[PDB]
Design a protein around this motif. Structure first.
Motif, PDB file in Angstrom:
ATOM      1  N   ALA A  48       0.811  -1.226   0.000  1.00  0.00           N
ATOM      2  CA  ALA A  48       0.000   0.000   0.000  1.00  0.00           C
ATOM      3  C   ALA A  48       0.846   1.279   0.000  1.00  0.00           C
ATOM      4  O   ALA A  48       0.451   2.278  -0.596  1.00  0.00           O
ATOM      5  N   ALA A  98      -9.602  -2.458  -0.469  1.00  0.00           N
ATOM      6  CA  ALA A  98      -8.798  -2.883  -1.606  1.00  0.00           C
ATOM      7  C   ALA A  98      -9.695  -3.090  -2.802  1.00  0.00           C
ATOM      8  O   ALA A  98      -9.481  -2.476  -3.830  1.00  0.00           O
ATOM      9  N   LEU A 119      -1.994  -4.161  -5.238  1.00  0.00           N
ATOM     10  CA  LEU A 119      -3.282  -4.452  -4.616  1.00  0.00           C
ATOM     11  C   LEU A 119      -3.503  -5.971  -4.589  1.00  0.00           C
ATOM     12  O   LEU A 119      -4.133  -6.519  -3.678  1.00  0.00           O
TER      13      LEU A 119
END
Ligand SMILES: [Pb+2]
Ligand SMILES: [Pb+2]
Lengths: 309, 307
Positions: free
Chosen positions: A74, B73, B234
């Motif tokens: 992330a 996500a 991701l």
């Protein structure tokens, strides 16, 4: 008599009492058996509870490693979000400056109708200037031929007149040939002038269709920015989840070291209990061995009553 | 005399009750230590139970977070999709600007051709100025030459002096048209140089319109790469999400048995504490019967003297 009949009544009660002590002490040895089975249950369960601790530590270790992967994947996704945001502001700034280029194509291409119609003006201007020269020519021609034919009808001196009149006529029709040539070019000039207004209408059409069509990509670029700022907004929620995950995993590992520290103290208390039980069994053993020295002596007083009493 | 064995027997039954009492005291003391150690297992167990609840709670929010991340996500995955779709068009509307451009680049070529047909149309037209003028000046001198002699012949020049005259005059009109054409052709010629800018300022300005659109091209395939890294990134958390759920399933099943065993231990403390109470009772049964034997060993030593 009452000296032995009481020595009997006496030994009756002690023989009767010691027998109660024997079972009260038999009841005790049993309770001791049950306690042990319970002490071992504590022990066995204190072993499984210890195993329950190892499984969990493995879970805190997987979770952490997992939250680290997520914190990094992330942390890097967000960085590409600013790169995509920049290529957007950039591609935006470029495209808006192609319109500026296309708008300069507006005024600059505009200067063309001044040119097309300035030349289109030299139509009747030059054509009429030529149409006049045709008229003059055909009239000189008819005029000239008339002297020549009429002059020849006299004779001698008419020779001289007919000659010049005829050369004038020859030149007269040379001007007519010149005029019918200056005509094809003025007519070509026409199409190349008029058919040109057709391109000014095509470049103007293609200026507008291509210009506003550019601002379609500009909105699309604006939409990725929004799309990308939502992604960043999503990574940011993910940071916070990660923070919650790091805190939750920690309090778990503290609660787990605390179990090792409490299961140990139970194991040690169980240990103390077992020793204490082995000492209870000792004294219980001493009562059993002494219930003999009393019973033997309690019936050894029987044969003394049969005789003396 | 035989109150010999009465004493030797009332001596032993006194020396044993003595040890029972002592044994019974040792039993009572140990009993008091076990209860003490027993009530300590309770405390540590209560503490173990807390750790279990703290872990369950900890393990629970670990799950809310995992789901929260799984959701966040997912959504980011959508946005990246919405982003790539717009990269197709951003490139699309440009695959249209290059074609609109090449169309106008050629529409601009049409004009040099126009301006060229005009310049050539003007150089060809000037020779006609030259030719007509020449012919008119020849006609003039010739018509003068005809007059300078038509008047001579005799009264026969009547109509010949008339024609020579209007021919000269007719030829004088031809000079005029040419001078007016010369005037307009020049105006036309200068039109060419003025037209010059619009002509090439076009292929020049369409040129850099193509440059800026192509820079937007590369700046745009570069995003489909940047958003490609994000999907891959991701994709790395989705995989981490399966571990976490699995990790919470391993943690809950552990804590689940730990709850059982904690109860199984508490329940054992309960049995022991009750069994200890049965022996205290048994200890007292013995301490009461120790007294009865002392009285019955004391009343007997009285016989030892009495008799
Ligand atoms: Pb918490
Ligand atoms: Pb002892």
């Amino acid at each position: 008599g009452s000296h032995m009949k009481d020595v009997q009544t006496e030994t009756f009660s002690v023989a009767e009492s010691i027998e109660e002590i024997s079972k009260a002490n038999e009841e005790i040895t049993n309770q001791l058996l049950g306690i042990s089975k319970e002490m071992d249950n504590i022990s066995t369960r204190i072993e499984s509870i210890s195993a329950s601790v190892q499984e969990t530590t493995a879970g805190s270790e997987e979770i952490s490693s997992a939250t680290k992967n997520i914190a990094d994947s992330a942390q890097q996704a967000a960085s590409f979000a600013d790169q995509s945001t920049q290529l957007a502001k950039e591609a935006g700034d470029a495209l808006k400056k192609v319109i500026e280029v296309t708008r300069m194509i507006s005024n600059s291409a505009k200067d063309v109708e001044r040119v097309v119609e300035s030349f289109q003006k030299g139509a009747e201007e030059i054509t009429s200037f030529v149409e006049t020269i045709n008229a003059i020519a055909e009239q000189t021609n008819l005029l000239a031929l008339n002297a020549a034919i009429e002059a020849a009808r006299a004779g001698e001196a008419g020779r001289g007149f007919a000659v010049v009149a005829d050369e004038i006529r020859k030149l007269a029709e040379e001007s007519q040939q010149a005029s019918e040539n200056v005509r094809r070019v003025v007519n070509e000039i026409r199409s190349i002038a008029e058919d040109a207004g057709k391109v000014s209408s095509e470049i103007t059409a293609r200026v507008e269709e291509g210009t506003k069509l550019a601002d379609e990509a500009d909105e699309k670029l604006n939409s990725i920015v929004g799309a990308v700022e939502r992604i960043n907004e999503m990574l940011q929620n993910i940071a916070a989840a990660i923070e919650e995950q790091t805190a939750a995993v920690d309090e778990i590992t503290t609660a787990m070291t605390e179990n090792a520290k409490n299961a140990e103290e139970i194991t040690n208390s169980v240990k103390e209990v077992n020793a204490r039980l082995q000492e209870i069994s000792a004294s219980t053993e001493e009562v059993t061995s002494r219930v003999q020295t009393i019973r033997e002596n309690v019936q050894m007083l029987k044969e003394i009553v049969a005789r003396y009493k």
